[PDB]
């Protein structure tokens, strides 16, 4: 029952003037917030996105972020001027921040920073630090960021106190969405797979939640070891799509079935015969 809470920030700085910052917030694999660059306020994407915070607590938290976004934008611009001409636009900065909730009031918080797609900085303990592999020039920005006691105190409180509390409330308020069960629907299809006289069968599974699932090709009761699971692909309705392929001989398709096991089916496995 372990859920990870992820606040994901993407910031593009094209040149000296132009920049945009956009954020999305995930609890497990469900989106709880969106904060577009064009919006002054953070948007709830679920009815329970405020968690168990009062309207006054939320306003105060949002205000802190509103100040952050403006301040972050100016800070990066000033850091670029400080390192010039070492580093120059365009620049992408990503933040991954939040907490992982464990049973019984246990949690770890994190705040990871990526520069041009590479993880270089985190907040750790009471300060900013570079991580192994990071270029040496970041030592001056780190020195400058660590000079700001007020940001340090605030971030410590956000990571240590605010994140775990907020998320605990999210889990209560959003229980019924997080524990939803949505049934997979399967279907079969076939293609030529760049070979002499081989066909590739495809078992399509779509509409299931949550993500954990089992899909295998079977001749009777014999699991076909050639079965290749693809990646989990999202649907727009916050369900998952998956396909499992089996490479076979034309004419030998007869006998094969696709078995699908999922928590939502309650023992009634889906079996599609070719």
């Amino acid at each position: 029952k372990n859920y990870t809470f992820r606040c994901l920030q993407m910031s593009s700085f094209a040149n000296r003037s132009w920049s945009r910052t956009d954020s999305v917030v995930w609890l497990g694999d469900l989106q709880t917030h969106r904060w577009s660059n064009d919006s002054a306020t953070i948007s709830f994407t679920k009815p329970w996105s405020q968690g168990k915070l009062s309207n006054q607590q939320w306003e105060k938290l949002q205000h802190m972020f509103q100040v952050y976004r403006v301040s972050f934008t100016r800070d990066i611009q000033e850091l670029v001027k400080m390192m010039s001409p070492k580093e120059d636009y365009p620049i992408e900065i990503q933040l991954s921040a939040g907490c992982e909730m464990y049973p019984g009031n246990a949690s770890e918080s994190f705040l990871h920073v990526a520069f041009q797609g590479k993880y270089v900085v985190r907040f750790w303990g009471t300060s900013w630090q570079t991580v192994p592999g990071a270029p040496s020039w970041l030592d001056l920005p780190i020195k400058v960021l660590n000079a700001d006691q007020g940001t340090s105190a605030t971030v410590q409180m956000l990571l240590n106190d605010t994140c775990p509390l907020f998320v605990r409330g999210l889990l209560e308020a959003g229980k019924s969405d997080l524990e939803k069960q949505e049934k997979p629907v399967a279907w079969l299809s076939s293609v030529p797979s760049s070979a002499h006289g081989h066909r590739q069968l495809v078992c399509h599974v779509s509409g299931f939640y949550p993500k954990p699932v089992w899909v295998m090709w079977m001749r009777g009761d014999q699991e076909q070891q050639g079965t290749h699971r693809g990646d989990f692909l999202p649907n727009a309705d916050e369900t998952w799509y998956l396909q499992a392929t089996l490479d076979v001989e034309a004419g030998e398709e007869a006998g094969l079935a696709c078995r699908v096991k999922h928590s939502s089916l309650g023992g009634q496995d889906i079996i599609l015969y070719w």
Partner: T-cell receptor
Amino acid sequence: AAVTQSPRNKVAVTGGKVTLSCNQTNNHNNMYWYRQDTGHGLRLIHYSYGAGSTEKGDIPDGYKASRPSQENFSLILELATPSQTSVYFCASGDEGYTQYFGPGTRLLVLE
Amino acid sequence: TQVEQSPQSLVVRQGENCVLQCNYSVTPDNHLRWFKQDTGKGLVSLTVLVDQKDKTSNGRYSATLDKDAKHSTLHITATLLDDTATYICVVGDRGSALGRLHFGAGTQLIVIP
């Protein structure tokens, strides 16, 4: 952390070249030029994060900055105007928020 | 302007107290400093306030800061002739060199000896 400015006082003609200089032996990366005029707070003209760096402040027009070394930060009025009659203040600092101000330079530009 | 001081000027008699006011719209407000500037001279720091609800003292000078109201006062107790000067309010918007300073235009105090 001591900061010095020279000259301390300067009379100049319109169209003349004026160089206001600031020296600082604290090994501060960061230096800042302001002007003070009656009815206004100090306003930032140019600043510098190190040797070779200059940045536009709030009112940079009519001024060129120059940071040839860690120690020296210069404000250059290439074509001085009477509107640049003012008191000019230089400051330095490290990564901390404190700016340490020089004693000021009085500039009068006559017609 | 983002920093306003009141009164613009005032005359008091030696031994009397006075209050100087600073109001700002600067965001964020990391810290606020009060400067003393004698006529034709430089900027002597009197105090720096950093807390949400802060109080400082330095001899006859004491100060308060209320960040919610965005308001600071400087109190001078038992004024002397040498308190004759301009008093300038400054707000720094960062706890580091990434900060911009926002200067008030100052209050002129004259103490009659």
